[PDB]
Design a protein around this ligand. Structure first.
Ligand SMILES: [Zn+2]
Ligand SMILES: [Zn+2]
Ligand SMILES: [Zn+2]
Lengths: 229, 194, 199
């Protein structure tokens, strides 16, 4: 097991809508998965076939959680929309969003300059050979996460491709960094599969668990995530 | 497989204006300038580039003879059959070209100036209304990177044709009064293996 | 529709020419030396607004005929959208057919811009009461612009030439009453296909 670390920053702003006209503050790992699968199909890579597999259970993408001037990731504030890093507060929040009115199109973005965590957890080392190639393409051109990729919104640039290994969590009690798939969890989560080869945009809805919640689970390996805490 | 990459550097030849889309930053700037220029929060100027390339190929190919889908119309909903919808987008499948914003190489303090624009009466020959609009100086180098996946043979030539149509009509806003005339320098690259 | 009328306009200055700098920072930098800087590029070439001069010329002349052109020059006055001037240069909700470029000089500011002393002389004493340095453009300075008419109509070119003949009589730019801005326009028009670049 290993992971590729990164201080992924935004060249142009990203627009990710949620339900209830909510715009997400930071970019999520689902968006990274959806973009990297387009990369692997576009470069005729084999893992693209696994990219259209939503339960491959290797190459799991952790959320692009924002990084602070404290050098640490903003830990998500428990049961709250905004985030707060363990060192100081520096609290992210909505102020970073801007209401956009552009040619009829009224939407929102999140501004550029803030840095976000790259963390691609990979299990199979055979997949790491293609993983080095896809992080090496982004290294040259960039990745686009958001809406209006063809208009140019969402351009991301890595500044630190680091393939440093890691180990899973220890405590059973873990904090939910990202929203987790837990049935009858009363926190509705929506994403989609596009399947551009065969069309049929999906808009898959679910009722998983929300982020910022301490939960005890001995059967935990750590799209939810496990914070060691 | 081999996706087509077009590095488009743009040099501003007459002052550029593109209005700012974000309401909060536009409201913040409205104090100093009635018309703020479109700016990033990294203090750099971004320009929309997809729509101008699209509308260039729309009017050129429409009057050429190849029937296309007039976008920017009353309804503006496009087909999935004509050439522009195979390049710059369709109501169903994604467009084959990803057109990045023309980000600037320089910063706000080095290219962006506030200016007195005017409205003069035709009998008293004196200024009736004055307003303060922001522009980008001439000789300012912007950059963008077009991404045409599934490359057809008439792709780079069509993009260059559209850029010539943009070099003569202009990019941005206030296009009829002389704002927006630029030059485009173009380089191309296919990428195969990484 | 299938054509565009491109009017290449080359204008020579028969008089000293002044158009003021609009840019706050450039004007503020120049007021350390000259109280009236001229409007230049960062390429260091003189820019003149051209669309508003043509529009003003055609509104005064077409209102002098008796045609129902509106006036887009008063405070709060809106374009009506039905005139020939509203068709040629624009309306609120209807983009103009003429893409009038800026009058960009052929030479640079060292060649054609001169810092000039202007005065205010007291009438009774016949002595200088105010002095101010201001930049002006020399005579014989050549400027080029292109007026690109989209959806070309019959009258347009002649209308543009008529508007140019107004600007040849009155002037373009600032200090027009003092003698500044007297110019001479030469027209070289060409009807061209709008699909010229597709090849
Ligand atoms: Zn902090
Ligand atoms: Zn179409
Ligand atoms: Zn009118």
């Amino acid at each position: 097991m290993k992971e590729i670390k990164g201080i992924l920053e935004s060249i142009t702003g990203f627009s990710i809508p949620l339900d209830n006209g909510e715009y997400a503050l930071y970019p999520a790992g689902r968006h990274l998965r959806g973009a990297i699968g387009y990369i692997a199909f576009n470069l005729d890579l084999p893992i693209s076939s696994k990219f259209l597999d939503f339960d491959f259970d290797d190459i799991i993408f952790r959320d692009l959680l924002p990084i602070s001037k404290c050098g640490k990731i903003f830990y998500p504030e428990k049961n709250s929309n905004s985030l707060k890093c363990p060192s100081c507060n520096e609290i992210y929040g909505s102020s970073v969003l801007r209401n956009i009115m552009a040619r009829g199109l009224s939407y929102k973005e999140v501004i550029e300059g803030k840095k976000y965590r790259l963390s691609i957890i990979v299990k199979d080392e055979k997949y790491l050979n293609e993983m080095e190639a896809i992080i090496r393409y982004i290294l040259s051109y960039g990745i686009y996460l958001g809406n209006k990729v063809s208009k140019g919104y969402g351009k991301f640039k890595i500044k630190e491709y680091s393939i440093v290994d890691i180990l899973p969590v220890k405590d059973s009690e873990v904090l939910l960094l990202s929203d987790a798939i837990i049935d009858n969890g009363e926190k509705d989560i929506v994403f989609s599969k596009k399947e551009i080869s065969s069309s049929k945009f999906e808009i898959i809805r679910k009722r998983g668990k929300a982020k910022g919640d301490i939960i005890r689970d001995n059967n935990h390996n750590g799209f939810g995530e496990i914070i060691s805490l | 497989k081999t996706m087509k990459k077009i590095y488009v550097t743009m040099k501003t030849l007459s002052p550029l204006y593109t209005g700012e889309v974000r309401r909060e930053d536009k409201e913040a700037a409205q104090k100093r300038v009635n018309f703020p220029v479109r700016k990033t929060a990294t203090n750099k100027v971004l320009i929309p580039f997809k729509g101008a390339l699209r509308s260039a190929l729309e009017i050129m190919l429409k009057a050429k003879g190849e029937n296309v889908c007039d976008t920017g119309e009353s309804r503006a909903r496009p087909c999935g059959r004509c050439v522009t919808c195979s390049l710059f987008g369709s109501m169903g499948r994604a467009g084959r070209a990803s057109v990045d914003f023309l980000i600037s190489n320089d910063t706000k303090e080095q290219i962006v100036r506030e200016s007195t624009h005017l409205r003069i009466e035709r009998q008293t020959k004196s200024a009736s209304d004055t307003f303060k609009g922001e522009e980008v100086i001439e000789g300012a180098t912007f950059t963008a990177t077009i991404t045409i996946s599934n490359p057809q043979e008439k792709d780079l030539s069509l993009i260059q044709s559209a850029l010539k149509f943009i070099e003569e009509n202009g990019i941005g806003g206030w296009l009829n009064k002389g704002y927006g005339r630029v030059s485009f320098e173009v380089k191309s690259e296919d990428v195969a293996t990484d």
